[PDB]
Amino acid sequence: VYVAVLANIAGNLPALTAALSRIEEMREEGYEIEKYYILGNIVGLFPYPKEVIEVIKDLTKKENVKIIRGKYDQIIAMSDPHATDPGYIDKLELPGHVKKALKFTWEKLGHEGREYLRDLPIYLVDKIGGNEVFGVYGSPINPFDGEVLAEQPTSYYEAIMRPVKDYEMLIVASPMYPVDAMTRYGRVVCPGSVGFPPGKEHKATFALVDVDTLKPKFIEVEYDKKIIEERIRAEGLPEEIIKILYHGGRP
Amino acid sequence: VYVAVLANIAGNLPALTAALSRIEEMREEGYEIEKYYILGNIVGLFPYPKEVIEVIKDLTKKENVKIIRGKYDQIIAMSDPHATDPGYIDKLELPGHVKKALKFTWEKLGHEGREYLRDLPIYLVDKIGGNEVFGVYGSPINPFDGEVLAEQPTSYYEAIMRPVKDYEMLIVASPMYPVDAMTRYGRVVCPGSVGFPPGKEHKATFALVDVDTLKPKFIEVEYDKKIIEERIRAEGLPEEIIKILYHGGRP
Numbered sequence: 001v002y003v004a005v006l007a008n009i010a011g012n013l014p015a016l017t018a019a020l021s022r023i024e025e026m027r028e029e030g031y032e033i034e035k036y037y038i039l040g041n042i043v044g045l046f047p048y049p050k051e052v053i054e055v056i057k058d059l060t061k062k063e064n065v066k067i068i069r070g071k072y073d074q075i076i077a078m079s080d081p082h083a084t085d086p087g088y089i090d091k092l093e094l095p096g097h098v099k100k101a102l103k104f105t106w107e108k109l110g111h112e113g114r115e116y117l118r119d120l121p122i123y124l125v126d127k128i129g130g131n132e133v134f135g136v137y138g139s140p141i142n143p144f145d146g147e148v149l150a151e152q153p154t155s156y157y158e159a160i161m162r163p164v165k166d167y168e169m170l171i172v173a174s175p176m177y178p179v180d181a182m183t184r185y186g187r188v189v190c191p192g193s194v195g196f197p198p199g200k201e202h203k204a205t206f207a208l209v210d211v212d213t214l215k216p217k218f219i220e221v222e223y224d225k226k227i228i229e230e231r232i233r234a235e236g237l238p239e240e241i242i243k244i245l246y247h248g249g250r251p
Numbered sequence: 252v253y254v255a256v257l258a259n260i261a262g263n264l265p266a267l268t269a270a271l272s273r274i275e276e277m278r279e280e281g282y283e284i285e286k287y288y289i290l291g292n293i294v295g296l297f298p299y300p301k302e303v304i305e306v307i308k309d310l311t312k313k314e315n316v317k318i319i320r321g322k323y324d325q326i327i328a329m330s331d332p333h334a335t336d337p338g339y340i341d342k343l344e345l346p347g348h349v350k351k352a353l354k355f356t357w358e359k360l361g362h363e364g365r366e367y368l369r370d371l372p373i374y375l376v377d378k379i380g381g382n383e384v385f386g387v388y389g390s391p392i393n394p395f396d397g398e399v400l401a402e403q404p405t406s407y408y409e410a411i412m413r414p415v416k417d418y419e420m421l422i423v424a425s426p427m428y429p430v431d432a433m434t435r436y437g438r439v440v441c442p443g444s445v446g447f448p449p450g451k452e453h454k455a456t457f458a459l460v461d462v463d464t465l466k467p468k469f470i471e472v473e474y475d476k477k478i479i480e481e482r483i484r485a486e487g488l489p490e491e492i493i494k495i496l497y498h499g500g501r502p
């Protein structure tokens with residue numbers, strides 16, 4: 001019995017599709033999936049924002065699913081609901097290629113898609129087994145702009161867990177790699193990144209968390225970067241997004 | 252029955268003492284007070300940081316109390332746990348008089364006081380009645396630097412409640428004045444300020460939240476500012492803290 005924990009889809013439909021199909025295969029292999037946690041970014045740099053949302057909505061009907069929004073989702077959601085274009089984004093402190101990806105996302109979502117992100121919770125507060133879990137995109141101190149690093153010593157995660165020590169587990173998206181850090185205050189976990197490559201040769205990465213022990217099993221799944229590349233060019237988006245696709249980046 | 256909700260003690264012992272004494276008096280008059288929520292800032296501008304913590308500690312032994320830290324508390328907690336002086340504060344984006352108050356608080360607390368603040372939660376998550384409640388110092392988007400304003404239209408509070416709509420009530424400290432705004436997503440409440448005067452002729456302000464209806468009753472209690480003025484001068488702190496005591500300010 002496990003909870004499937006996914007993060008940072010970032011508008012990448014092929015990676016999301018590959019992760020969920022792998023989860024279905026693993027069900028056939030004796031892994032019982034009680035429920036799903038999906039952490040932002042939900043939409044972002046990659047050009048399938050409406051399709052990602054459709055897949056999540058179907059899953060939310062069929063399964064027990066809890067979702068929280070990430071930094072890119074918030075940039076879209078915070079906009080005036082009556083705005084006629086995504087011009088407000090150019091004022092923000094962001095790289096040029098990121099502004100263009102988010103303006104594209106804003107337009108392609110329409111009013112219904114923007115509204116869906118506005119309904120997304122910031123915080124995940126849940127129980128698995130007898131254990132209480134707290135989830136946030138960035139860090140406890142700063143939900144959208146906070147950054148928890150991967151590959152740090154136990155003391156690092158202990159200091160982060162301390163202000164949320166009421167909980168048995170903290171889940172964050174911002175490390176972008178698998179994190180599994182037992183501390184005196186609880187366990188800090190990052191499932192990895194489904195659709196936002198942090199480096200080269202990225203595989204869609206997520207975790208199955210054991211409901212009894214809270215130990216994560218990290219899973220990696222290949223997806224086709226070819227159709228994504230061809231979809232970016234066909235929508236007229238910066239060449240820098242293709243670089244991130246094959247070389248990595250930080251949101 | 253009621254929950255006593257208090258915020259922004261900010262190191263002001265006489266104001267905290269007067270509010271708690273009024274709560275005890277209202278219980279003598281036949282008010283059922285079952286628990287306490289205490290929101291930051293716990294310490295800050297006023298020169299009674301150690302004593303405020305002793306009153307809270309004693310109250311936590313005898314009553315059902317949930318506490319969260321505020322901006323000023325976080326600035327102290329953030330610091331390297333065996334730094335020798337509060338020199339790090341001089342590099343922060345804070346007015347001169349605020350820097351001096353916080354350096355004094357850092358020293359007066361000692362290691363044991365600094366560690367007490369490091370143990371305080373960021374988030375309040377609770378049930379009262381069958382109603383879920385979420386509390387944070389600043390705002391849901393930004394726990395320490397976020398600001399929810401008083402005296403805005405209903406639509407302003409609705410957009411703030413929307414990302415925490417899974418809850419029946421949001422409690423924030425940052426307005427500094429009583430707020431009680433029903434929205435379609437839940438009720439946004441600020442209890443007022445116990446020890447940080449927002450303007451002139453300040454009384455210690457807090458709320459009793461009806462457990463059934465979630466309607467706040469705002470209570471104002473008088474306290475002595477002259478003894479505080481005397482302690483500020485005796486301890487060498489800036490004249491601007493005295494100006495805040497009598498004419499108000501913002502953290």
Ligand code: NA
Pocket residue numbers: 164165166167168169184185186
């Ligand atoms: Na814990």
Ligand code: NA
Pocket residue numbers: 415416417418419420435436437
């Ligand atoms: Na609600």
Ligand SMILES: [Pt+2]
Pocket residue numbers: 078079
């Ligand atoms: Pt904005």
Ligand SMILES: [Pt+2]
Pocket residue numbers: 182
């Ligand atoms: Pt272990």
Ligand SMILES: [Pt+2]
Pocket residue numbers: 329330
């Ligand atoms: Pt710091």
Ligand SMILES: [Pt+2]
Pocket residue numbers: 433438
């Ligand atoms: Pt209501």
